[PDB]
């Protein structure tokens with residue numbers, strides 16, 4: 208069984224699953240302290256329910272919200288929008304790139320206890336258990352980030368829940384992550400190396416898949432175009448087209464690694480952790496939101512000759528194998 | 535105006551009595567107490583320790599504390615309200631930002647920060663309806679660009695509401711002078727500002743010049759001393775190795791210079807701490823088993839023994855905080 212914000216579900220219930228998404232990208236305590244930053248909590252919730260319902264109509268049945276503590280994860284919000292949209296949401300533990308001081312000062316043993324409490328006991332006082340561990344590193348792994356990755360590996364080994372990562376693909380950062388995970392005795396089949404569509408280095412990706420890692424091609428609609436004077440939507444966006452990113456999926460399929468591929472949008476319905484109104488920038492670039500994968504990428508791959516059963520394997524079978532707790 | 539926001543609602547300033555103007559129930563990080571209460575044993579254990587501690591402070595004469603924990607120090611006003619009611623000690627809550635703002639705060643403009651501080655003063659903290667009665671800000675010795683935004687937003691919020699501003703400084707780097715310059719550039723009266731952690735320095739020229747300008751001087755870490763614990767680097771780094779009597783003698787020094795009306799005294803104590811090394815609360819509790827009662831039980835008799843009149847001490851512990859906290863436009 209897989210833990211969701213509404214309780215446990217069987218593997219067969221998960222269906223078409225988006226493995227790297229967010230309801231809201233924020234900071235610990237921020238949604239509660241300043242909901243008017245998002246208009247209101249109600250407005251944010253209502254936008255998310257419409258968004259999830261659009262995704263559901265395009266075939267999505269489950270999303271994995273990989274928002275951590277320090278991304279301002281509010282599982283009560285996730286539970287509310289999941290119930291109203293009838294879309295399963297898997298919540299995350301772990302730490303992203305903005306840990307507060309009370310986290311930054313902790314040992315690997317302490318972080319392991321924290322990740323374990325969120326998986327085994329529940330998040331806050333909600334009883335909602337995490338079904339995935341999210342971690343992030345920048346280029347060369349910092350000392351604190353290494354502690355996070357080891358704590359993640361140890362919590363995964365104790366519970367069977369998988370680990371999913373944020374990296375800089377342009378720095379081939381998955382290699383350093385993999386080294387740390389393997390030193391801990393973690394199976395690569397429990398690990399998704401994410402934001403992997405941010406590079407054109409196919410050799411780097413194939414090497415990881417060969418070692419048994421899941422490859423997260425999860426920022427496909429963040430491609431953007433026509434924003435090279437933007438001091439925000441050029442370093443956070445790019446200039447590579449989304450079709451170019453999408454073709455990495457075909458490339459990995461053709462090398463015989465369709466079972467290793469996970470695809471997502473890395474979308475959200477509110478964001479406070481960047482510039483004000485960046486949500487408007489994102490929504491203008493990708494009006495499809497979380498429906499971008501099923502509405503654009505899947506038909507694009509089908510028209511490039513990828514068979515239905517392969518597309519179903521990638522969007523249904525692979526996430527189920529990944530999320531089902533396994534040791 | 536003649537009333538102050540507390541976590542149980544508004545009180546008249548006459549009700550504040552003996553007030554500790556820089557304290558904490560818990561030193562933490564946003565969201566942390568709710569996500570990981572076992573770090574503190576349990577939320578219940580932490581609340582109980584705070585109530586026992588506040589009750590002892592109350593027995594020693596304390597009637598009000600100002601909890602200067604901000605959003606990013608993990609302020610949980612619901613905890614403050616629970617322990618205030620159970621200890622029957624007034625607690626004034628804070629808005630502002632300390633030294634650990636998350637991205638969602640660090641990326642905000644001075645106008646946005648102003649709106650956040652005003653929300654916490656004028657509307658309430660989170661969904662609790664509890665309103666802040668003070669704005670807490672913190673800087674590095676050299677004020678960073680973001681910290682300067684925070685100080686300007688604090689000044690603007692103070693000017694709109696009358697509620698005071700209190701600061702964290704590196705007194706050894708004379709941090710208060712850069713802060714004062716920013717505050718005054720915004721038109722904020724020095725009488726609305728406490729330059730805190732000023733007992734970290736023995737430079738009386740720095741202290742008296744600020745006091746002469748009408749600033750309140752926070753001599754607010756009196757019990758903090760790692761003397762006898764020099765072999766504990768974290769203790770020394772957090773508390774210094776100046777004695778509590780050395781810190782306390784600055785209270786006398788500013789009185790002797792004629793600035794009794796500018797002095798505010800406190801412990802900068804707390805009942806749990808996650809924003810430093812593990813188990814540090816045990817180190818603090820061993821250094822100062824009196825907790826927040828340290829000021830009334832140890833420092834006040836020390837100053838009376840040094841000859842300071844009872845009326846002067848009452849003015850510092852009662853009148854000065856009342857004048858400071860009372861919203862004044």
Ligand SMILES: C[As](C)(=O)[O-]
Nearest residue numbers: 229232473475480
């Ligand atoms: C806050 As993000 C760019 O990881 O969705």
Ligand SMILES: C[As](C)(=O)[O-]
Nearest residue numbers: 558561607702802
């Ligand atoms: C919470 As503190 C050590 O900055 O007074």
Ligand SMILES: [Zn+2]
Nearest residue numbers: 343373374402
């Ligand atoms: Zn990411």
Ligand SMILES: [Zn+2]
Nearest residue numbers: 228229273473
């Ligand atoms: Zn993400």
Ligand SMILES: [Zn+2]
Nearest residue numbers: 701702703731
């Ligand atoms: Zn301080």
Ligand SMILES: [Zn+2]
Nearest residue numbers: 556557558802
């Ligand atoms: Zn303090």
